[PDB]
Amino acid sequence: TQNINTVDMGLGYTSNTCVAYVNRVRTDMGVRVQDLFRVFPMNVYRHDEVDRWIRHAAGVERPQLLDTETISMLTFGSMSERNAAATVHGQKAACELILTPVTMDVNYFKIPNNPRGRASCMLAVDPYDTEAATKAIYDHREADAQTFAATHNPWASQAGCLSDVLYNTRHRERLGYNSKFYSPCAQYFNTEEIIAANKTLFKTIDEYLLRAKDCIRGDTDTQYVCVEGTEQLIENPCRLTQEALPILSTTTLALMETKLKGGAGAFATSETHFGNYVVGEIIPLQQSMLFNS
């Protein structure tokens, strides 16, 4: 054993870092939805026939836990999804679905935005002012800082709406959720972590360097959250800016085809037909960056 003591000799940040190069995607960048039946394994329908019929249609098996002790164990934390026989597209990046009114603004998805429909970045709020932080996040008699509407999804931005009870970890654990499964919505919907992250500028960036990071198992098919100290913590800029990035998607195969025919930079534009649209990606990841090297 050796004792080492380090003391910092700068009165500012004497060190810089940058994400210089990227050389593969660990995930599939797929469209496979999250299987809530694994995440909330305890729930059943009160009627045996409705339950069995819905489980057959959804392709799910009967909730298999040696109820009492193994349920207490799972609510303590458990890794309960088997791997597929073969993987060619790496790790399964599952999609978390937020129900959305069919009249949501399509321009909302064209720029990086909070997917819950109302902005919640605490860097715009006065440090340690939890009253103003809570008002900014939830008060729908106040205009949203980004768009100045109350919301673009009433079922996601309010306190106790469907997606708030679904994806806020404090509501998830009043439900019987399995903690081991990673959830993309958690950073935007854990509003208590967001309130607590509301510090001053330099305290915020120091905390970003230390604690505001992800942990995902690298060897499993599914995204399981790992404990601290077994492998590296994963930086996620979306935890600071509190936004999701728009990926190239379309409603029709025609517009995808014209994107493939197009020149370089075609992926970055978001034209629309009458009822059919494209959202272009905001960074040229898929087109040039991943496949250049």
Partner 1 sequence: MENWSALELLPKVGIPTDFLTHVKTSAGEEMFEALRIYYGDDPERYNIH
Partner 2 sequence: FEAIFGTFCNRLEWVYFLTSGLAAAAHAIKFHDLNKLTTGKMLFHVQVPRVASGAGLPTSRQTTIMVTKYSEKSPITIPFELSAACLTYLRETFEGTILDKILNVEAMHTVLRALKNTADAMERGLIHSFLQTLLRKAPPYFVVQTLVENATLARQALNRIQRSNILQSFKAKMLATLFLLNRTRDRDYVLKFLTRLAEAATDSILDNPTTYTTSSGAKISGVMVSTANVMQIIMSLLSSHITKETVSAPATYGNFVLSPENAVTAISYHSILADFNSYKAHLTSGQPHLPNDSLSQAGAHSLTPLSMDVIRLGEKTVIMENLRRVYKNTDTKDPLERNVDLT
Partner 3 sequence: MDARAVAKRPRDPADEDNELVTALKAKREVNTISVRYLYHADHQALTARFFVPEGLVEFEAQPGALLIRMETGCDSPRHLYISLYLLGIRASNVSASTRCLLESVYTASAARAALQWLDLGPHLLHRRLETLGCVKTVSLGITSLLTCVMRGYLYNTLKTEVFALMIPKDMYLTWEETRGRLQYVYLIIVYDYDGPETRPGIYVLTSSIAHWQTLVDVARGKFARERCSFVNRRITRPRQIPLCTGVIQKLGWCLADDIHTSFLVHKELKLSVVRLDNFSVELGDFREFV
Joined tokens for residue 160? 């106790």
Number of residues that bind partner 3 (CB under 8 A): 12
CB of 199 to partner 3, least distance (A): 22
Joined tokens for residue 7? 């003391």
17 makes contact with partner 2 (CB under 8 A): yes
203 binds, among partner 2, partner 3, partner 1, none (CB under 5 to 8 A by kind): partner 1
Whole-number Cα distances in Å, 70 to 37, 67, 104, 178: 17, 6, 42, 12
- Return d(Cα 114, Cα 32) in angstroms, integer: 21
227 makes contact with partner 2 (CB under 8 A): no
**Residues in Cβ contact with 14 at an 8 Å cutoff, skipping those fewer than 6 apart:** 8
139 close to 86: Cβ distance less than 8 angstroms = no
Selected binder of partner 2 within 41, 117, 184, 280 (CB under 8 A): 184
Residue range at the interface with partner 3 (CB under 8 A); choices 52-60, 64-72, 193-201, 279-287: 64-72
Amino acid at 38: R
199 binds, among partner 1, partner 3, partner 2, none (CB under 5 to 8 A by kind): partner 1
Selected binder of partner 2 within 218, 252, 262, 265 (CB under 8 A): 218
49 close to 73: Cβ distance less than 8 angstroms = no
78 makes contact with partner 3 (CB under 8 A): yes
9 makes contact with partner 2 (CB under 8 A): yes
72 makes contact with partner 2 (CB under 8 A): no
Selected binder of partner 1 within 55, 199, 213, 217 (CB under 8 A): 199
3 makes contact with partner 3 (CB under 8 A): no
- Return d(Cα 89, Cα 128) in angstroms, integer: 44
Selected binder of partner 3 within 12, 59, 160, 229 (CB under 8 A): 229
- Burial letters for 226-252: b for 16+ Cβ neighbours within 10 Å, e otherwise? beeeeeeeeeeebbbebbbebebebee
Residue range at the interface with partner 3 (CB under 8 A); choices 43-51, 65-73, 112-120, 191-199: 65-73
- Return d(Cα 191, Cα 195) in angstroms, integer: 6
Residues that bind partner 1 in the complex, under the rule CB under 8 A: 10-13, 199-203
